[PDB]
Design a protein around this ligand. Structure first.
Ligand code: MER
Length: 252
């Protein structure tokens, strides 16, 4: 919208390492960013591309979930919402949800129902305090889905780390509840948490995301993959993330 809504230009005041992950990306285009808690250091593939701002799509469900927890729209005894009986083309959407099922199955109406209860001024205050991308709410409708709100791959990592790790106004209860909703994989070596996002424009994939974090016995890593071309799906961003985290030794 304005001159700075498509790119993030704030200098990293941290140690950083440039990665070459181009063979894993293959025919796809985009970037990968990871932050290590123990190192206080960023590892970035395609640094320029990582600072380009894009619609967060379903990754913004992270923040809607936190806002809904923070405003007591949902809690830990009850995060249930009944289905209004509108038929969706996905059967997982056609039923009652809780935060866990809605996050896992990316059920838009659940998060839309949350967003409708949140006053615009509260969201504006949150996005400022979080430094969330361009902070642009536009018409405040489904503003996180191929609309005015945009955020870069680099910012996805920085903003999520800061939200979760700083002592701020979100409670520990809310952060823990959001975390359980994001858990994908847990074994002896690691816990993998995250959320895919896909933007569909004219039936075509336009924008793929996977934003998350890994807890190991030694460290905690925040990461994000964005795809802008090739086959830019959430599914493919997740696959690419997994192979990169593996190569880097984060999953082992
Ligand atoms: C979020 O970005 C969108 C929805 N989220 C995702 C995603 O997680 O990447 C998809 S893609 C895929 C298509 N149908 C699947 C589904 O909903 N179920 C199997 C239950 C997920 C959506 C397109 C967007 C609409 O905000």
């Amino acid at each position: 919208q304005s001159i700075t809504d498509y790119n993030y230009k704030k200098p990293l005041h941290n140690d950083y390492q440039i990665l070459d992950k181009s063979k894993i990306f293959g025919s796809n285009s985009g970037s990968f960013v990871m932050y290590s808690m123990a190192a206080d250091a960023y590892y970035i593939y395609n640094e320029k591309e990582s600072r380009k701002r894009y619609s967060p799509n379903s990754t913004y469900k992270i923040y809607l979930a936190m806002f809904g927890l923070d405003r007591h729209i949902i809690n830990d005894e009850n995060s249930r919402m009944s289905w209004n009986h509108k038929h969706y083309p996905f059967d997982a959407w056609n039923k009652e949800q809780d935060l866990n099922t809605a996050m896992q199955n990316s059920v838009n109406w659940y998060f839309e129902r949350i967003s409708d209860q949140i006053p615009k001024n509260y969201t504006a205050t949150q996005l400022k305090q979080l430094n969330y991308g361009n902070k642009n709410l536009g018409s405040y409708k489904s503003y996180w889905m191929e609309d005015s709100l945009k955020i870069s791959n680099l910012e996805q990592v920085i903003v999520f780390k800061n939200m979760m790790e700083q002592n701020n106004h979100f409670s520990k209860k809310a952060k823990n509840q959001l975390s359980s909703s994001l858990l994908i994989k847990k074994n002896e070596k690691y816990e993998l948490y995250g959320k895919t996002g896909t933007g569909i424009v004219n039936g075509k994939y336009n924008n793929g995301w996977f934003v998350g974090y890994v807890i190991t016995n030694h460290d905690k890593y925040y990461f994000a993959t964005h795809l802008s071309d090739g086959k830019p799906s959430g599914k493919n961003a997740e696959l690419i993330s997994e192979k990169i985290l593996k190569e880097m030794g984060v999953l082992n």
